Symmetry: D2
Subunit: 448 residues, 4 copies
């Protein structure tokens, strides 16, 4: 059947039912306004409000029957309201279109979602900082080109992700403020000649103020694009977190062991511990980017004002949102269920001459042009490579072959533990510098 095919193709209730709390809040505000403006009676208002709250209790109770033949969340709720309370229900359509209603509902849902995500992000930040604090003294390699470049403190590495998430949080805060303007009162696109008060409904629904352009009100989906992007950049942070942790849990790296409860394995190979949760965090970054491209492509090239294509805005946003929330929480649980392999890590450090840059710094302190200090440290490392020692084990006499500036104080700058203590610049991996940043984060996240 044609109308049956088209019904199935155009219905949105299968997905848009999740807007129910926002829709009800939006309708209550609309009705309160209508009464205050003299377009309905107080009596009709009290009826609408009590009816809407009854339907809400019914949905919370999983006793509400959603219907395809009723199209969407708005008509499903309006039609049930009418069955419950009679004619007053029909008064909700006064000075209102689904165009402006859906925009209101969807912005309200986004606002609540953003709020939830910020709580989740702070939780992940805390989980990372608690892990940093648990391993504050542990030295690991820092990498460029996935080659060992310099020794860093494990907390400094973890604070990288904590700082990335702070930028994410900042985007979410800016996203929320930009979207917190009311489209309600725009009607189908042009506003109304009826005496509504859009300032009153804006305020009732916690919006900053009403949007100043009704065509903009019904045609705008920037708040969707911005939310999707914010989720995509957040997902990227977590994808790099995931790459990192899948590497650290490999045997080649050997740095991290996940608990049984966040890994899988083999009956016949009992040391194999697969970090499936973080591999899925990495992979789920893909869908979040996909969701963003959807709505970008959707909006491209569309004429004004309202077009049915905009119905396609919701499922990507719901997907993106669900996905990031999962990623954030899973990452936090993973952070709480890993331990570092101190002996394996400490064994691996000596062979990399990670203290070379600290030695070059020593020489630069003593007056040597940097390019000369690097050549000389280069040579010394080659000596250590052939002899199979560390720089720390070279004699002062050996160093004096290359320059007279070397003195006995040089040994305070050699070995990884001394190298780490010698970093001193703001934001560096130095012990006191990392200590300060940790204290800053403890205080900001209210950790105790």
């Amino acid at each position: 059947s044609v109308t049956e095919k088209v019904e199935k193709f155009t219905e949105s209730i299968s997905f848009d039912k999740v807007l129910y709390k926002q829709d009800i809040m939006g309708s209550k505000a609309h009705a309160s306004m209508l009464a205050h403006q003299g377009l309905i009676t107080d009596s009709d208002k009290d009826s609408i409000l009590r009816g809407l709250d009854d339907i809400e209790r019914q949905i919370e109770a999983n006793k509400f029957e959603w219907r395809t033949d009723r199209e969407d969340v708005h008509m499903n709720i309006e039609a049930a309201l009418t069955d419950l309370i009679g004619e007053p229900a029909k008064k909700l359509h006064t000075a209102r279109s689904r165009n402006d209603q859906v925009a209101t509902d969807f912005r309200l849902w986004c606002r609540d979602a953003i709020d939830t995500i910020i709580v989740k992000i702070r939780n992940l930040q805390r989980a990372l900082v608690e892990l940093a604090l648990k391993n504050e003294a542990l030295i690991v390699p820092g990498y460029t080109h996935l080659q060992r470049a310099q020794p860093v403190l494990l907390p400094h590495v973890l604070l990288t992700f904590v700082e990335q998430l702070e930028r994410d949080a900042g985007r979410y805060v800016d996203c929320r403020a930009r979207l917190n303007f009311s489209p309600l009162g725009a009607c189908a696109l042009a506003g109304t000649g009826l005496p509504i008060d859009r300032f009153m409904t804006a305020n009732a629904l916690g919006f900053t103020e009403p949007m100043r352009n009704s065509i903009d009100a019904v045609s705008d989906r920037d708040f969707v694009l911005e939310f999707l992007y914010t989720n995509a950049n957040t997902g990227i942070h977590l994808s790099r977190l995931g790459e990192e942790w899948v590497l650290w849990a490999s045997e080649e790296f050997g740095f991290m062991t996940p608990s049984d409860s966040v890994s899988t394995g083999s009956s016949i190979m009992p040391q194999k511990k697969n970090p499936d949760p973080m591999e899925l965090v990495r992979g789920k970054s893909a869908r979040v980017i996909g969701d963003l491209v959807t709505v970008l492509t959707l909006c491209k090239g569309l004429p004004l004002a309202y077009n049915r294509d905009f119905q396609e805005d919701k499922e990507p946003m719901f997907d993106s949102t669900k996905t990031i929330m999962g990623m954030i929480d899973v990452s936090a649980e993973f952070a709480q269920n890993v331990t570092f392999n101190e002996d394996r890590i400490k064994k691996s450090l000596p062979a990399g001459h990670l203290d070379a840059t600290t030695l070059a710094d020593y020489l630069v302190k003593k007056g040597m042009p940097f390019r000369s200090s690097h050549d000389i440290v280069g040579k010394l490392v080659g000596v250590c490579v052939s002899k199979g020692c560390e720089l720390q084990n070279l004699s002062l006499e050996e160093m004096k072959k290359l320059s007279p500036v070397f003195e006995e104080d040089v040994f305070g700058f050699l070995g990884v533990e001394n190298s780490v203590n010698k970093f001193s610049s703001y934001g560096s991996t130095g012990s006191n510098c990392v200590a300060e940043q940790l204290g800053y984060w403890v205080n900001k996240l209210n950790i105790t």
Copy 2:
């Protein structure tokens, strides 16, 4: 040769040369800080500053030869500097890596770029508001589903774009603030033991403060992602403006005629005026979306800290920025070179029955319920377009046949001029509301 081929593939000068002004700025700051902290001499510093000024001047005069064999902008400048001033140039890279250098320069280039784009947008907002003021009384159909729905004022439609562009500006402003933290002094990834000062360079370069984490400073490209997405959303807006204007320019609409300076024609069919620029504006939103996806995919799943993949960050930001600036400026030129065909728009409006919703509002104000009001107007339009006429041509007698609430004042609410006059909600297309909004924008954009 193997060396030939890897050189060509890894070379970045062919594109990163556009960073020259920022690279020189950053190097003057670093040199001044080195000198202040006793890591180089004042005479070294002075030689470096004059040398760099010389090189900048030579670039501006197109007399500087860029070299593939010098890899990138940083080494191209520093080898030239060495050839100009000798040994002092070689101390410039003390306590500095290309890692922290490039991220600093790119950040500065983005700050400059965002500032330029914000100026371009205000110019386009001005061009739109001026177009609106010139055509303040022109009524056109407002559309849903590309079907005529309500009568609206041309200025109200144009203000939709002005409002969209204002959310864009807000995004540029929020993006610039978040990016304005200094990575300089992170060195390769871990910071340094040399007594630099990161606060002093941050101050000299206009950054709010140093970034708090050295690994984050070298590893982060969020600022690229945020600017690319802001460009993309702006381009989405311009793509809709494009779509509208290709439509308006069509014979089928006949709403607008572009000047010959902004259109192509045909000697055999002299009435064919193609709006090539706006078609290109809509089409160029695609490249800006592609640029965003490039760099999202770039960052996805990369380990810490610096990887050579991050060299791919620059060409997409350059392409996106240049495209959007071109799209903003040609859209303003176009806005300044279009005329509306008032006689043709006027003759099309009557047969719509666009006054129908206004008549319905008239009845709701008289105390009719929503559905009843629609039922009545329903009937009235049949009795009307059965005689190929307009509602305002009906007699009061035939109106009172359908309901007694009709009175003589009803004619004040029929026809599109009256319909437009009767919209009264904030942000509506109503004559007074639109004048209020035009006054707001005239003040905000310092128009005279």
Copy 3:
């Protein structure tokens, strides 16, 4: 709110991968049959397994089968069910197999089945388009460049454009299916096995062309998913253009097309507003199809060998893309059967625009004029007409002779949109006989009849 509970909910795939049951069961039976043949299980094990899996297929088809999150995925749901049903022999089904080769085999089969279905749906739409074309076979509309009127074309020529697009689409679908039609089964976790399986037998049993040559490729490859997503996306593009065309044609400004009530919405106070929602949504649905492709491109990029758990994310987007494109195709075909063309509106709009100009130029060139002179003379004459308020065909031969003695009485069979269209003659042109030729080709190839 336990970790095990949180991780279970995040890693479970049964909520979406249950749709592979048919192919999963078909694979497992081919597996068990090969095992028995090769002596790795008894024939009574095989018979016991085939019976059980049929019982389970019936239970699923009857909505009597309880899918379980604690059983993770389709593979483990089914096999745990098989164990509860037949006991010991079910346990032997895992012999010389991994979920790695198993999942790749199942998904390949599902994709081959999905592609066969899409091709049929495309033939349908092609048929609906050619039938609409034949029903409106003599109708003339403007052809557009830059959304400006360029030349007069036959509506059938325009609809055949979309039929030709869809024909390239069907072509990609066939090539895609051919490349994916190689068996991963028997790669095990990634390295293969030392057990005496026969990969040729299972490949043949499952309709695959031959076994894949590399065990590691077999578990790690998702190209078939990428290529099918891309092919859906390009089909989606074509339908988005169709969507945009028809949303314009149903505008009042164009006024070329009226959709039936069954494929439109409207307004009780504005009875002439007819919103073509299905086509707007077809247009809009092309976006999620592009998004699903980007998802899987980004998923695969930069991943090491061989199998990785990120690959679990390949399914939901392929399922979304496939369901979306099938709906887009089916609804377009339905809309093509529920539209009529507003003949008098079209005819009224045509003659202001001078679409016959190029035909008059072609007339002058055949009479010997150089092409540059011909375009200048016709531009001038169209100037005379714009001024006078007329069509070229209403000018007298005396007015044309003012501009060139070349014009003769025969010129009049070259003017007007009906004459214009009859005079196109290049292959693939909008010419009357050309479109007829092309319509015969599609009537033949799609087996269109009048009964």
Copy 4:
């Protein structure tokens, strides 16, 4: 200071010659074929055709010598060439546009360009396949771990890992062949969108330019950019494969894996840390897969929602396709060079292998072949691996006595199945890592690629 008109500001935005000049060779070939058909069909004189064909050859020679000044005020490649042609030969040049439009001209030119680019890419892919097969041949005996979830799963042969990438690239080559065939139809003679009533022969020009046939629909011929989309997609899939190769080799060149050392000619280093070898070229290969995805999204987004027939938006199809093609050629060629400049660290690889119980599965298969069901065989093997973990030993160090406490089926032939070298010897399924299997596959490839 020269004050610019509006017309000048707009010309800068809409000019395409800055990028489309790279089509000159296709454009001149298309125009020559056009003129030849014109003369044959009587629409121009043979004298006029000869002048046109000679002027176009001269112009092509001037471009090849870098004596040709491209001009932004001539808009595009088509107009640059034809106005230059008019300046050279005068009036005959003006007959060139008889029965042709830029709409059908550009579509012909870009198809010719794309057909040549695919032909070049196929060659470059065969080269990379050969480089990979020779690296495999030179390292045929070397055993390395095979990973799932970046955890050691099984022992495999290095050649079998490299043949994964050869098999990938063979699918890529198939898509290029299929893509080229589908795009090899001539739009020429569609004119602006509707054809023409002049007596052209579209089959003649199609054959002259190596197309299979003229396209069956004039509107489709000027509106279609499927060939572009399909090429971009094919590039992007190829780029994903090269991104996995990049990821692999960056990991392998790490200290932690320590499997592979690149030559100095394909890596970068550090004077202070002379042992640090960065695989920058393979990092960039991985990175450049991104822009190839971006270029596909560009033209996908571009085509979405556009009405028929030709729109000016379509000029945005050239730059992505040029970028995509250049990038993928670079990634393929550099990958082939990197493959020819790596060596494997045989002692480093070998020292890691023996402690991961990589032989456990091969013991499980031994038990299945002796008649134990799958589930009991894994029970037994998990228990024996359990004893090795505790005793800090390998499986091949267990006694036949200890094993017989779990199951009678154990006999002395069990030790032919244990240890990493035996494990790899025991794989035997078609397409498996067994050495006889891989040998058969290498011979297939050596023959297929005509390696001598």
